Amino acid sequence: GTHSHGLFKKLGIPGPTPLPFLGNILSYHKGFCMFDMECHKKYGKVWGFYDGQQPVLAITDPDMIKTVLVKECYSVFTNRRPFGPVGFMKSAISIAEDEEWKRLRSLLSPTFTSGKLKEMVPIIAQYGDVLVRNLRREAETGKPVTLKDVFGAYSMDVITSTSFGVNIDSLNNPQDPFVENTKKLLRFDFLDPFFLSITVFPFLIPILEVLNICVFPREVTNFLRKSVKRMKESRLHRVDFLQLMIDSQNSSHKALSDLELVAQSIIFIFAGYETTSSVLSFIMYELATHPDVQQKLQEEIDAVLPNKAPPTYDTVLQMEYLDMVVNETLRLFPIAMRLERVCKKDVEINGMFIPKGVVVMIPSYALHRDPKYWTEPEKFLPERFSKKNKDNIDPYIYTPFGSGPRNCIGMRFALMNMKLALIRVLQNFSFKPCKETQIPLKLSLGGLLQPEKPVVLKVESR
Amino acid sequence: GTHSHGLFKKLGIPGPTPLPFLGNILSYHKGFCMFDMECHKKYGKVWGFYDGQQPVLAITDPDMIKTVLVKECYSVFTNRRPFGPVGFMKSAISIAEDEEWKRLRSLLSPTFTSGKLKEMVPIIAQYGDVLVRNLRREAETGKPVTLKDVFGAYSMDVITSTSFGVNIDSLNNPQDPFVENTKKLLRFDFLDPFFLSITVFPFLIPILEVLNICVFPREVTNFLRKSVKRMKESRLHRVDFLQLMIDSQNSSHKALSDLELVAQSIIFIFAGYETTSSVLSFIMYELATHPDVQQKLQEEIDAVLPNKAPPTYDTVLQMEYLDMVVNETLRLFPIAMRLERVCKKDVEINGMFIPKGVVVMIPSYALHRDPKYWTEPEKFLPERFSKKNKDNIDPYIYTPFGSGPRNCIGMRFALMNMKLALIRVLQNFSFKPCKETQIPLKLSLGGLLQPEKPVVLKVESR
Ligand code: HEM
Ligand code: HEM
Ligand SMILES: CCCCCc1cc(O)c2c(c1)OC(C)(C)[C@@H]1CCC(C)=C[C@@H]21
Ligand SMILES: CCCCCc1cc(O)c2c(c1)OC(C)(C)[C@@H]1CCC(C)=C[C@@H]21
């Protein structure tokens, strides 16, 4: 069962020896992050391994990364790895391939412009107030707070109102039928018993397709397909993603059909719910364990927003230290962990031959903690992103949102969404560690970049 | 189980109603040929059906056929339908796809030039003598001859000597180890219990790949892989396909590797063994049931080749009535039956939208027996291809070797190979029907264009 396990030895590329059928997946017992760091340590700039029979070439050269992600993106490295039975979510932009992706990425790009985002801040700002009033209930009761719930409700509060206009206090209505379905849209643990079996038996993916089995629960999508169906029939002015997409199909490319439009609204929740929630928990953990950084940030917030002034789009871009705190956290915790591109031709880039079918991988977690580009990479030093030192940062080493034409389309939204939370939250509360707080934080050995234990902290009102 | 069975009704294309999972394959109980004729009768110029879940759009417009096979061949309709677990025969030119095919088709095109073919006639001519001496043994014994064996041995006699230089009287040595393996390379009956299950369960193809199961018997290819391995080690001048390919890798494209070179030699046998043998049986059946055509051909042969003169390359191209007999037979019996191309993009050709993934099919058998282009299409009238009437023949209606960049690469060889047999055979023997001869001939209801019963005829010596 080693039809292709001799490839990296033929090309003369170092890497760990694979087992038959399994490849190197037994080395995932400590997570993707630990595996990438160690391979980078042993083998250096380029190494290869096997996800079962699938060869994966890892690369850490900034020139090589720019070629893969930007230069030869359209011509060679256009798609990501197929990951399992997807059904009608083939129409989602992150899942679509080749010209279908290029068309979708164009039909949805004006939806994520800064000008469209500025019109969305009054909707995002409203649920910072909901976020604060939910926090104040737990602050004057003295109970340590579990961030992933109060923040998980916030990330859901923003999605429902900016992606459909549904206004729900999901923390005090954690039980409305619309919240039940959308909360079942968590990010995928590719080290769970399922996707590991997908890696060993990729020939089983076409099987699950003909059985209508999907990695997106059919009930959730069936609920949202008819829910959007009823929303579009009711609207027959506002700044919500669904509206901008409805306006898109109301015209070079074919207009977004009805099923394609629903599939995008679903992938926006999938890419934004647990991601936004997890980064906001990582940031508050660092603000708690470094009170000096939390105070300096609170001083800057009140300096731009006197007397707890409500944050605007412009006053958010005005806060440089807040952007430093966010950027430094995303360096330590790049929740995607990896970037992947499927090589679709036989190409030679930067003096290295890469054959068709090989998955090229950029280990983001490993590069963000590389001592050869970062001084004391484990420490939380927001000054790395000061306007003085941000020039010395290579944009292909620090890729928390990826790079190139296939980078995070919701990057501006995700950063504004997180910053509006921190501003309103730090305007009202200080965050101090608890005896039950895991210090130092340990990561999950699974397939998602998340804390081993949920981050619990103390919340005091200023 | 009808995820895509609504496609042709959405596009408004007529066709037979499909059953869940099965599609229209139950209509194959009378063969592909009967199914194409009837659909052409009911629905007209364009219709659609389903091979399970796979939509197949049939087209019969000459302008549309030229677009599919020539104009938009490289850009859209480059590949044929995937057909089952293929293994290392992915490297065969007929199986390869996209740029890999374009590269192989270039590395092998100078191998099939007329100039290379002229140097192969002395090898092909030698086994016409072997073919005659095998026929003479059965002619003066009065036994009716089964053509598919005496001709099957001839088509194998030509392949072994022109593809490897192996000189075997496969009719009197039907038992050498080299003949045993190569005779297991028959054309595929896509209506047998296997490939019908492949059509219903295409998700099972990736399964059979990981089990090393291949539609080419592993023992045969393993025998030939090491046999060619020993042939190339022994050669370390002649006009054999293996030599021309060995010369190709002895240099814009990468040279043919060792496994690719073996895979081509195998696909040449697969495409040439039963095909050449079956056409030669169809021709002799028509020469037997139309003695007037057989006499006129024998008169032309002796007029170009006096006193049973051995046929040269030039004297073969000199015989126009022989070319008429061959062409008229290939019209009645286009052994490929169909041409197929997978639509790889969303394209609109000649005012008709065709979506990505649909297999476009050209029903050759049906078009060759279309009364709207042929007068009395069932009758064997070689005068249709007379130099006077051959101008009125549309090259996209009569496609026995296909058309466009992906047509039969061995067309010139196959025609010369068959004609050299008929010349030498008609120089020595006349062929008269037997009481056991099936008159009129009935075709096999299976998935191969072949007689229902083997053609048995009487052979008398002139
Ligand atoms: C903390 C928040 C987020 C982080 C860290 C993040 C990170 C990423 C990364 C690393 C990628 C892959 C880039 C690449 O492959 O080069 C990506 C893709 C993507 N993200 Fe985000 N993301 C976040 C939030 C969001 C949000 C709020 C949206 C809202 C729509 C979103 C939508 C997408 C989409 C659609 C893609 C795929 C784009 C394509 O394939 O063309 N993400 N994200
Ligand atoms: C009576 C003899 C033969 C007939 C009727 C025949 C017919 C055909 C047809 C209809 C096609 C497909 C064309 C298309 O898809 O448009 C084809 C393809 C092909 N044939 Fe033949 N063939 C014959 C003999 C041979 C021989 C002797 C060879 C020797 C090498 C050969 C090699 C091939 C190859 C390699 C292809 C695929 C080419 C490609 O995919 O680029 N065939 N043949
Ligand atoms: C087995 C092959 C794995 C590839 C599957 C895969 C991996 C992956 O990291 C992502 C996928 C999909 O979908 C999108 C929506 C792009 C996500 C956006 C946000 C982040 C943090 C993760 C992205
Ligand atoms: C289920 C999809 C069916 C496609 C498989 C398929 C169909 C087909 O008609 C042929 C295939 C392969 O291979 C080659 C070598 C091109 C053959 C050449 C000679 C003739 C008569 C048949 C050709």
Numbering used by the authors:
A (entry chain A), B (entry chain A): 26 to 261, 267 to 281, 286 to 496
From the study:
Our spectral titrations showed that THC is a type I ligand that induces a blue shift in the Soret band of CYP3A4, leading to a nearly complete low-to-high spin transition. The X-ray structure was solved to 2.72 Å resolution and contains one THC molecule bound to the active site. THC approaches the heme with the cyclohexenyl ring (C-ring) of the tricyclic core at a 40° incline angle, whereas the aliphatic tail points toward the substrate channel. No significant structural reorganization is required to accommodate THC. One slight adjustment is observed in the I-helix, where two central residues, F304 and A305, shift away by 0.41 to 0.46 Å to allow THC to approach the catalytic center. The most notable change is in the R212 side chain, whose guanidine group moves up and orients parallel to the tricyclic moiety of THC, establishing cation–π interactions with the partially overlapping benzene (A-ring). The ligand-binding mode is further stabilized by multiple van der Waals contacts as well as long-range polar interactions formed by the A-ring hydroxyl group with the A370 carbonyl and R212 guanidine and by the pyran (B-ring) oxygen with the S119 hydroxyl (4.2–4.5 Å distance). The aliphatic tail is flexible and not well defined in the crystal structure. Importantly, the observed THC binding mode is productive and suitable for oxidation of the equally distant C7 and C8 atoms (4.1 Å from the heme iron), the preferable sites for CYP3A4-dependent metabolism. Thus, the long-range polar interactions with S119 and R212 assist but are not critical for the THC association, which seems to be mainly driven by hydrophobic interactions and steric complementarity with the active site.
